[PDB]
Amino acid sequence: VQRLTYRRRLSYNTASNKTRLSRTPGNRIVYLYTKKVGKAPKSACGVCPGRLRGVRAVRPKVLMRLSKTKKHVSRAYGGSMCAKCVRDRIKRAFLIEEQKIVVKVLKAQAQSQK
Amino acid sequence: AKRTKKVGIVGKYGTRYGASLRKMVKKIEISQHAKYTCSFCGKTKMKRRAVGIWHCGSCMKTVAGGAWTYNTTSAVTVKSAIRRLKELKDQ
Amino acid sequence: SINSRLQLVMKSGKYVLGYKQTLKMIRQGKAKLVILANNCPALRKSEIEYYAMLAKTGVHHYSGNNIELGTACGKYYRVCTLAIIDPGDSDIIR
Amino acid sequence: RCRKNTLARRKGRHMGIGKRKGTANARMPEKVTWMRRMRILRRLLRRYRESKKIDRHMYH
Amino acid sequence: GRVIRGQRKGAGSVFRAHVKHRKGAARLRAVDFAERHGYIKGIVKDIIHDPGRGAPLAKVVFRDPYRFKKRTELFIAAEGIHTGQFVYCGKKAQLNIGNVLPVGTMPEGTIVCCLEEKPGDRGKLARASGNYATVISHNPETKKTRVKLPSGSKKVISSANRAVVGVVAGGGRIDKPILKAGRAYHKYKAKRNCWPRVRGVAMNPVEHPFGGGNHQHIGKPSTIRRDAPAGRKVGLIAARRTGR
Amino acid sequence: PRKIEEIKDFLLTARRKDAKSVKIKKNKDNVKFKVRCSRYLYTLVITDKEKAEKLKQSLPPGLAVKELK
RNA sequence: CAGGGCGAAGCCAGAGGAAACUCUGGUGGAGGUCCGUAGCGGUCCUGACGUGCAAAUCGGUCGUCCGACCUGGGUAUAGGG
RNA sequence: CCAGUGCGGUAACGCGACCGAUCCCGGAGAAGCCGGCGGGAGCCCCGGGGAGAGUUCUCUUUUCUUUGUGAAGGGCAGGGC
RNA sequence: CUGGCCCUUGAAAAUCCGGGGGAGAGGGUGUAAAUCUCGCGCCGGGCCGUACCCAUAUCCGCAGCAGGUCUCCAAGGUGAAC
Ligand SMILES: [Mg+2]
Ligand SMILES: [Mg+2]
Ligand SMILES: [Mg+2]
Ligand SMILES: [Mg+2]
Ligand SMILES: [Mg+2]
Ligand SMILES: [Mg+2]
Ligand SMILES: [Mg+2]
Ligand SMILES: [Mg+2]
């Protein structure tokens, strides 16, 4: 076995010097310095644990290179909420208003009676 | 009474700490590593997260309960009394 | 109470247990009593309570658990909601 | 010279009591002979069920 | 001759409080129209717990009724509070668990916590982990109210100041024995450097007045004047009795 | 490097202002047409050895065709 | 921060019992748990050395080795302090 | 004469671009220790072909060495949900 | 992936991002603003560090001193095993 060495002046295994083996065309196993594993966005509702769908999970300053469609998904609240909490925020924003109409007429009949 | 007679959970503390203390810790060490039934979704998923904070796995509710039981008796007898004090005031 | 009448419906009549099957029978219109329990997330309560009012169906707030409804429905498990399609001899329907 | 020895250890030479040094559990972990075994019987009952050999209620 | 430990807890700098990971002060949402006349609303976000405290905190989100924004607080969570509950605040709020009211409004015997000792100080009394403070009796004019604290002492408080209803969550934290020296070091490693405490009888007489001797004895009465100089004032400070 | 899949496509990329040095390796049935550009190096892998020599007579202006060997 | 030992809760079957539950066979892998490398320590020979390799080292034997463990850099506390 | 701030899928979502400020909400940066299991890799191993070696007193289809593809794209495995 | 343990719950900020909202902009029947631009083309990235030892002879112990000094990689055999 040939054993290998670090390549940059850093020699402490850290979150920074995270490596991997690669076989170059010179038959020379060499260290290749990987990138931190990026995580996909979590929902803004704050209840669903899973990271979203339809978005590239990648380190944040990389989102500058990427395209608009890689970063969102084409819906209401797309790319920030999970669509199980969107379809609730629709039919929750419905009946909050509807039973405000119902109390509006029950209040208009309570003063019409009195 | 299989694998042991009367230590159960606190067998993990071995010969140490004295009997009367290992014994007293037992009832506690049972009621905190116990999984209770959520009173929202009904599913047996209430687990202790840290001191006085209880989380439901399924419905992702977090609840401020007792130190190592879901409900201190002091808090339950207060909840009944606080509820009667506002029905006595406002009716 | 309704631990007796429901016990008769499951045995003799037709019924649907749950949601997305109950909601599909208020959609069709062939259901005429939706028995919610407490512990149903007040969103699914208020949305069935309204989705049923539009179809002219009685709603019932069984003082249950979503567990003391499955225990009442002769089932061995968790039923939050339920919709009675057809009664047997049970006058669960008023 | 090593490869000739390992052909003996295939037929069970030099495997006697007098050449064992670790515990029986250290040489073959009883924890591993679940995963070897339970996986074999479970993968059998899975092939037996989808083959309409046994029913669901027999299998469970 | 030396400067005794206990004299040193004042300069700080080692005997100083350990507060990197602490979530922030546990306050009570200072006053405005909403508190002084109405009943401002708000919902509970989470019940995150802070190091060094037995009570869990709660990030409660109101919305600032002056500028389009969302103020977020940290209330010492009353036992029973759950995520998603609506916490209402102010004078017109109704009496149930987790609603902050002015003590002047709620009836006697009400069980409250996170009380204020002067109006507006955003919560000071009865907030530890399992403590509460019972309201005793009112006095309409002079706008004062008598309140029993967990120490059992009774204090006259001005009726204005507010207090959340219910008991502090996390009761009985003292009930399970620490049970091993590790769990103690591991416990104060979140509060400050006051651990393994060496008894004075084991130190040489230059370090602590109860020192010295060819036996580990005290030597002079362990009760001491309240009018003592710092350094002597060690042992039973101004004890009125001494014994079980 | 980018693999161009269509014969007509790099006939456009080989007409750029930035294009230069269309290199031709003969790989024993893979005859490749690497056209260096500012950003990328577009190559076409031809499978039919006849279509390749026909393409040799298409580099329009007098590019720097360097038959690689 | 090798490899092993003991084997806690939980769980599964099988068996008894009327019920409470109790037996038996597994699983499972808890612990300021045991042996024991690395590491950190320094018991005993009252060994070596004792103008030394060394202004405190060196051998054999030893203690501990998932926790009140060991460490690198940054930062704080300065003389009756 | 009007219309045209992109289109597809029932839905998860898809498409190469798809108008837009002050302000607001959220995510990423952004997390302990330990156990178990699975996937990938490098290395280790075994069977068999090449090439060059070693031994050949006798025996050994022998023993030894070596037997490759980077980032960045493009496609599809196999993992996870 | 999935667990256990905690009276221990285990970092902040630059930076970047999506979304809400929708003030405003656009040309008037082929164009126009716009492209969190898709492809492609042009120009630029200054300043300082960068030898070698890393240790039973390049560091500290008055020395080429059995002392001390933080890491990375890490084959065959036997064996449970670094
Ligand atoms: Mg760095
Ligand atoms: Mg997308
Ligand atoms: Mg002494
Ligand atoms: Mg003195
Ligand atoms: Mg000696
Ligand atoms: Mg001598
Ligand atoms: Mg010498
Ligand atoms: Mg160099």
Report DSSP letters for D6-54, one per residue: HHHHHHTTT-SGGG--S-HHHHS-TTHHHHHHHHHHHHHHHHHHHTTSS
Question: Among all chains, which residue has been given the structure tokens 């959970």?
Answer: B9
Buried b (16+ CB within 10 A) or exposed e, E83-112: bebebbbbbebebbbbbbbbbbbbeeebbb
Q: How far is CA A28 from CA A7, A32, D10, F43, in A?
A: 14, 12, 36, 28
The Cα A3–Cα E126 span in angstroms is 64
Buried b (16+ CB within 10 A) or exposed e, C27-55: eeeebbbbbbbbbbeeebbbbbbbbbeee
E strand or H helix that includes residue C59: strand C58-62
Strand partners, A97: none
Judge whether B41 and E84 are in contact, CB under 8 Å: no
CA E94 to chain centre: 26
The Cα E178–Cα E159 span in angstroms is 40
Residues of B in contact with E110 (CB under 8 A): 82, 85
Helix (H, G, I), strand (E, B) or coil at E186: helix
Ramachandran category for residue C61: left, alpha or beta (phi over 0 → left; psi -120 to 50 → alpha): beta
The Cα D16–Cα D25 span in angstroms is 16
CB atoms within 10 A of CB E207: 17
Q: E147 φ, ψ to 5°?
A: -135, 135
Q: How far is CA F62 from CA A56, B17, C62, F56, F58, in A?
A: 45, 93, 89, 12, 10
State the nearest Cα–Cα gap between A99 and chain C, in angstroms.
Answer: 10
State how beta strands C58-62 and C33-37 pair.
parallel
Give the DSSP letter of residue E141: G
Rounded to 10 deg, the angle between the A86-113 and C42-53 helix axes is 60
Q: What is chain B's Cα-based Rg?
A: 18
Helix (H, G, I), strand (E, B) or coil at C32: coil
HSE, side-chain direction, 13 A CA sphere, residue E217: 6
* Strand order across the beta sheet in which E111-113 lies: E100-102, E162-165, E111-113, E133-139, E144-148, E154-158
The Cα E238–Cα C30 span in angstroms is 82
Q: What share of chain A is helix, strand, coil (3-state, %, to 5)?
A: 30, 5, 60
Nearest CA-CA partner of C67 in B56, B37, B63 = B37
CB atoms within 10 A of CB E28: 26
Nearest CA-CA partner of B72 in B87, B51, B49, B43 = B51
State how beta strands A21-23 and A29-31 pair.
antiparallel
Dihedral Cα D39, D45, D46, D52, nearest 10 deg: 170
Shortest CA–C1' contact from A25: which nucleotide?
H69
The Cα E103–Cα E159 span in angstroms is 6
The Cα E99–Cα E102 span in angstroms is 10
The Cα E150–Cα E133 span in angstroms is 6
- B-chain residue closest to E44, CA distance: B62
| CB-strand contact A109/I, under 7 Å | no
Question: Among all chains, which residue has been given the structure tokens 């080692």?
Answer: E14
Helix (H, G, I), strand (E, B) or coil at E206: coil
E128 to chain B, any CB pair closer than 8 A? The answer is: no
- What end-to-end distance do the CA atoms of chain F give, in Å? 20
The Cα B42–Cα B45 span in angstroms is 8
- C-chain residue closest to B38, CA distance: C39
Residue E117, burial from CB neighbour count under 10 angstroms (0-12, 13-18, 19+) = middle
The Cα C25–Cα B5 span in angstroms is 56
Resolution (A): 3.7
The set of residues, in sequence order, having a beta carbon less than 8 Å from that of D27 and lying 6+ positions away, is D20
State the nearest Cα–Cα gap between A8 and chain B, in angstroms.
Answer: 42
The Cα B37–Cα E145 span in angstroms is 41
Judge whether E223 and E210 are in contact, CB under 8 Å: no
The set of residues, in sequence order, having a beta carbon less than 8 Å from that of E132 and lying 6+ positions away, is B74, B78, E111, E112, E113, E126, E150, E166, E167, E168
The set of residues, in sequence order, having a beta carbon less than 8 Å from that of F12 and lying 6+ positions away, is none
Judge whether B85 and E108 are in contact, CB under 8 Å: no
Ramachandran category for residue A80: left, alpha or beta (phi over 0 → left; psi -120 to 50 → alpha): alpha
Give the DSSP letter of residue E117: S
Buried b (16+ CB within 10 A) or exposed e, A25-44: eeeeeeeeeeeeeeeebebe
Strand partners, A74: none
Judge whether B27 and B9 are in contact, CB under 8 Å: no
Question: Among all chains, which residue has been given the structure tokens 């530890």?
Answer: E128
The Cα E82–Cα E153 span in angstroms is 31
- Paired tokens of C8: 């008769």
Give the DSSP letter of residue E168: B
- Paired tokens of B12: 């993990």
CA E187 to chain centre: 17
Dihedral Cα E224, E230, E234, E239, nearest 10 deg: 40
| CB-strand contact B33/G, under 7 Å | yes
CA E182 to chain centre: 25
| CB-strand contact E225/G, under 7 Å | no
The Cα E228–Cα B36 span in angstroms is 54
C and D interact (at least 3 Cβ pairs within 8 A): no
| CB-strand contact A76/H, under 7 Å | no
* Strand order across the beta sheet in which E43-46 lies: E43-46, E57-61, E75-76
